[PDB]
Amino acid sequence: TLFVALYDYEARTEDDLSFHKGEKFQILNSSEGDWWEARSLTTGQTGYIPSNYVAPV
Ligand code: NA
């Protein structure tokens, strides 16, 4: 189950990940809260993303 970005997002710190609308992710840890550790299938970068900015594909 893959996820896609709904809006652009600029990370505030090194811990979150910036991304563009339409970018897709594999989710690495969702059980930690509403911010999920994810990997971009476009760039390969990794970081936390807000789960309310993605939807399942
Ligand atoms: Na969502």
mmCIF file of N, CA and C and ligand atoms in Angstrom:
data_model
loop_
_atom_site.group_PDB
_atom_site.id
_atom_site.type_symbol
_atom_site.label_atom_id
_atom_site.label_comp_id
_atom_site.label_asym_id
_atom_site.label_seq_id
_atom_site.Cartn_x
_atom_site.Cartn_y
_atom_site.Cartn_z
ATOM 1 N N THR A 1 0.813 -1.217 0.000
ATOM 2 C CA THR A 1 0.000 0.000 0.000
ATOM 3 C C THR A 1 0.850 1.272 0.000
ATOM 4 N N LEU A 2 0.855 1.952 -1.143
ATOM 5 C CA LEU A 2 1.659 3.134 -1.397
ATOM 6 C C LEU A 2 0.816 4.385 -1.204
ATOM 7 N N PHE A 3 1.497 5.504 -0.921
ATOM 8 C CA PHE A 3 0.831 6.768 -0.692
ATOM 9 C C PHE A 3 1.309 7.854 -1.646
ATOM 10 N N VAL A 4 0.424 8.836 -1.880
ATOM 11 C CA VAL A 4 0.699 9.943 -2.794
ATOM 12 C C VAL A 4 0.431 11.265 -2.088
ATOM 13 N N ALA A 5 1.277 12.260 -2.386
ATOM 14 C CA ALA A 5 1.150 13.586 -1.818
ATOM 15 C C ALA A 5 0.000 14.359 -2.431
ATOM 16 N N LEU A 6 -0.757 15.049 -1.577
ATOM 17 C CA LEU A 6 -1.888 15.864 -1.992
ATOM 18 C C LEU A 6 -1.547 17.322 -2.267
ATOM 19 N N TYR A 7 -0.482 17.814 -1.635
ATOM 20 C CA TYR A 7 -0.026 19.205 -1.711
ATOM 21 C C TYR A 7 1.489 19.238 -1.586
ATOM 22 N N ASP A 8 2.109 20.334 -2.021
ATOM 23 C CA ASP A 8 3.529 20.515 -1.738
ATOM 24 C C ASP A 8 3.761 20.721 -0.249
ATOM 25 N N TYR A 9 4.949 20.327 0.211
ATOM 26 C CA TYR A 9 5.312 20.482 1.613
ATOM 27 C C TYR A 9 6.805 20.747 1.700
ATOM 28 N N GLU A 10 7.165 21.803 2.406
ATOM 29 C CA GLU A 10 8.555 22.131 2.696
ATOM 30 C C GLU A 10 8.876 21.721 4.127
ATOM 31 N N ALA A 11 9.907 20.921 4.280
ATOM 32 C CA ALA A 11 10.285 20.472 5.597
ATOM 33 C C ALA A 11 10.744 21.653 6.440
ATOM 34 N N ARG A 12 10.430 21.605 7.732
ATOM 35 C CA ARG A 12 10.928 22.628 8.643
ATOM 36 C C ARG A 12 12.328 22.300 9.165
ATOM 37 N N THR A 13 12.624 21.021 9.414
ATOM 38 C CA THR A 13 13.921 20.608 9.939
ATOM 39 C C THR A 13 14.472 19.478 9.078
ATOM 40 N N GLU A 14 15.662 18.979 9.430
ATOM 41 C CA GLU A 14 16.199 17.800 8.745
ATOM 42 C C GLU A 14 15.348 16.559 8.982
ATOM 43 N N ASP A 15 14.512 16.563 10.029
ATOM 44 C CA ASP A 15 13.748 15.374 10.371
ATOM 45 C C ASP A 15 12.534 15.170 9.479
ATOM 46 N N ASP A 16 11.932 16.231 8.990
ATOM 47 C CA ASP A 16 10.844 16.016 8.042
ATOM 48 C C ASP A 16 11.382 16.057 6.611
ATOM 49 N N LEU A 17 10.514 15.698 5.671
ATOM 50 C CA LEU A 17 10.872 15.618 4.268
ATOM 51 C C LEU A 17 10.033 16.549 3.413
ATOM 52 N N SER A 18 10.707 17.353 2.598
ATOM 53 C CA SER A 18 10.020 18.185 1.624
ATOM 54 C C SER A 18 9.564 17.326 0.452
ATOM 55 N N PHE A 19 8.428 17.685 -0.139
ATOM 56 C CA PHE A 19 7.949 16.923 -1.287
ATOM 57 C C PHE A 19 6.969 17.763 -2.086
ATOM 58 N N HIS A 20 6.638 17.256 -3.270
ATOM 59 C CA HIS A 20 5.774 17.905 -4.230
ATOM 60 C C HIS A 20 4.464 17.137 -4.354
ATOM 61 N N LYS A 21 3.398 17.867 -4.650
ATOM 62 C CA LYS A 21 2.140 17.211 -4.974
ATOM 63 C C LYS A 21 2.393 16.154 -6.044
ATOM 64 N N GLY A 22 1.765 14.987 -5.897
ATOM 65 C CA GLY A 22 1.939 13.899 -6.849
ATOM 66 C C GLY A 22 3.087 12.961 -6.533
ATOM 67 N N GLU A 23 4.011 13.367 -5.692
ATOM 68 C CA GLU A 23 5.093 12.467 -5.307
ATOM 69 C C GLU A 23 4.524 11.284 -4.521
ATOM 70 N N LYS A 24 5.116 10.088 -4.711
ATOM 71 C CA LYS A 24 4.609 8.872 -4.078
ATOM 72 C C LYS A 24 5.602 8.334 -3.050
ATOM 73 N N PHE A 25 5.092 7.616 -2.053
ATOM 74 C CA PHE A 25 5.953 7.163 -0.960
ATOM 75 C C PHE A 25 5.663 5.722 -0.567
ATOM 76 N N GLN A 26 6.711 5.023 -0.113
ATOM 77 C CA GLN A 26 6.555 3.842 0.726
ATOM 78 C C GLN A 26 6.621 4.315 2.172
ATOM 79 N N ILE A 27 5.728 3.785 3.009
ATOM 80 C CA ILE A 27 5.678 4.145 4.422
ATOM 81 C C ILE A 27 6.490 3.147 5.225
ATOM 82 N N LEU A 28 7.432 3.659 6.003
ATOM 83 C CA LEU A 28 8.329 2.856 6.817
ATOM 84 C C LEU A 28 7.807 2.665 8.241
ATOM 85 N N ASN A 29 7.304 3.726 8.896
ATOM 86 C CA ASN A 29 6.678 3.606 10.217
ATOM 87 C C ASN A 29 5.460 4.519 10.327
ATOM 88 N N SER A 30 4.261 3.923 10.360
ATOM 89 C CA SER A 30 3.022 4.665 10.594
ATOM 90 C C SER A 30 2.514 4.555 12.035
ATOM 91 N N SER A 31 2.974 3.570 12.790
ATOM 92 C CA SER A 31 2.430 3.293 14.116
ATOM 93 C C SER A 31 2.908 4.270 15.183
ATOM 94 N N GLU A 32 3.764 5.227 14.833
ATOM 95 C CA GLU A 32 4.389 6.110 15.816
ATOM 96 C C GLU A 32 3.563 7.358 16.103
ATOM 97 N N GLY A 33 2.485 7.589 15.354
ATOM 98 C CA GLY A 33 1.734 8.824 15.401
ATOM 99 C C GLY A 33 1.220 9.186 14.014
ATOM 100 N N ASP A 34 0.792 10.444 13.853
ATOM 101 C CA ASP A 34 0.211 10.917 12.594
ATOM 102 C C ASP A 34 1.266 11.417 11.602
ATOM 103 N N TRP A 35 2.509 11.597 12.047
ATOM 104 C CA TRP A 35 3.629 11.871 11.154
ATOM 105 C C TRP A 35 4.337 10.553 10.886
ATOM 106 N N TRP A 36 4.501 10.210 9.606
ATOM 107 C CA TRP A 36 4.988 8.896 9.227
ATOM 108 C C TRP A 36 6.374 8.989 8.608
ATOM 109 N N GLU A 37 7.221 8.033 8.931
ATOM 110 C CA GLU A 37 8.517 7.943 8.274
ATOM 111 C C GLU A 37 8.323 7.269 6.927
ATOM 112 N N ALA A 38 8.770 7.934 5.864
ATOM 113 C CA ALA A 38 8.443 7.535 4.496
ATOM 114 C C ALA A 38 9.658 7.734 3.602
ATOM 115 N N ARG A 39 9.653 7.027 2.479
ATOM 116 C CA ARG A 39 10.676 7.117 1.449
ATOM 117 C C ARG A 39 10.047 7.511 0.125
ATOM 118 N N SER A 40 10.582 8.560 -0.504
ATOM 119 C CA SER A 40 10.049 9.002 -1.791
ATOM 120 C C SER A 40 10.456 8.036 -2.905
ATOM 121 N N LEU A 41 9.473 7.543 -3.672
ATOM 122 C CA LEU A 41 9.807 6.704 -4.825
ATOM 123 C C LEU A 41 10.373 7.513 -5.978
ATOM 124 N N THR A 42 10.260 8.842 -5.919
ATOM 125 C CA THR A 42 10.861 9.674 -6.941
ATOM 126 C C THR A 42 12.337 9.902 -6.630
ATOM 127 N N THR A 43 12.637 10.433 -5.432
ATOM 128 C CA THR A 43 13.993 10.856 -5.081
ATOM 129 C C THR A 43 14.765 9.862 -4.216
ATOM 130 N N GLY A 44 14.106 8.871 -3.627
ATOM 131 C CA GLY A 44 14.789 8.023 -2.680
ATOM 132 C C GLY A 44 15.060 8.662 -1.338
ATOM 133 N N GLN A 45 14.698 9.925 -1.145
ATOM 134 C CA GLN A 45 14.951 10.535 0.149
ATOM 135 C C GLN A 45 13.960 10.028 1.186
ATOM 136 N N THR A 46 14.347 10.161 2.442
ATOM 137 C CA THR A 46 13.589 9.627 3.563
ATOM 138 C C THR A 46 13.435 10.685 4.647
ATOM 139 N N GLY A 47 12.298 10.633 5.327
ATOM 140 C CA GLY A 47 12.043 11.515 6.446
ATOM 141 C C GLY A 47 10.591 11.414 6.859
ATOM 142 N N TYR A 48 10.221 12.204 7.884
ATOM 143 C CA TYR A 48 8.843 12.203 8.362
ATOM 144 C C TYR A 48 7.975 13.049 7.462
ATOM 145 N N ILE A 49 6.742 12.597 7.265
ATOM 146 C CA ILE A 49 5.799 13.384 6.458
ATOM 147 C C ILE A 49 4.494 13.419 7.220
ATOM 148 N N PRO A 50 3.697 14.463 7.036
ATOM 149 C CA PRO A 50 2.415 14.526 7.739
ATOM 150 C C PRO A 50 1.406 13.643 7.036
ATOM 151 N N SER A 51 0.774 12.739 7.792
ATOM 152 C CA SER A 51 -0.099 11.768 7.137
ATOM 153 C C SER A 51 -1.336 12.416 6.513
ATOM 154 N N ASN A 52 -1.714 13.628 6.937
ATOM 155 C CA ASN A 52 -2.855 14.321 6.341
ATOM 156 C C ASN A 52 -2.495 15.004 5.023
ATOM 157 N N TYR A 53 -1.254 14.881 4.580
ATOM 158 C CA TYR A 53 -0.821 15.368 3.292
ATOM 159 C C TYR A 53 -0.653 14.262 2.260
ATOM 160 N N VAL A 54 -0.996 13.013 2.585
ATOM 161 C CA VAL A 54 -0.881 11.910 1.643
ATOM 162 C C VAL A 54 -2.192 11.141 1.677
ATOM 163 N N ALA A 55 -2.435 10.392 0.614
ATOM 164 C CA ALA A 55 -3.573 9.491 0.555
ATOM 165 C C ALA A 55 -3.081 8.220 -0.105
ATOM 166 N N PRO A 56 -3.714 7.088 0.184
ATOM 167 C CA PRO A 56 -3.317 5.834 -0.464
ATOM 168 C C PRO A 56 -3.541 5.880 -1.965
ATOM 169 N N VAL A 57 -2.702 5.163 -2.686
ATOM 170 C CA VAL A 57 -2.790 5.159 -4.141
ATOM 171 C C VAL A 57 -3.911 4.303 -4.688
HETATM 172 NA NA NA B 1 -4.209 11.052 4.447
#
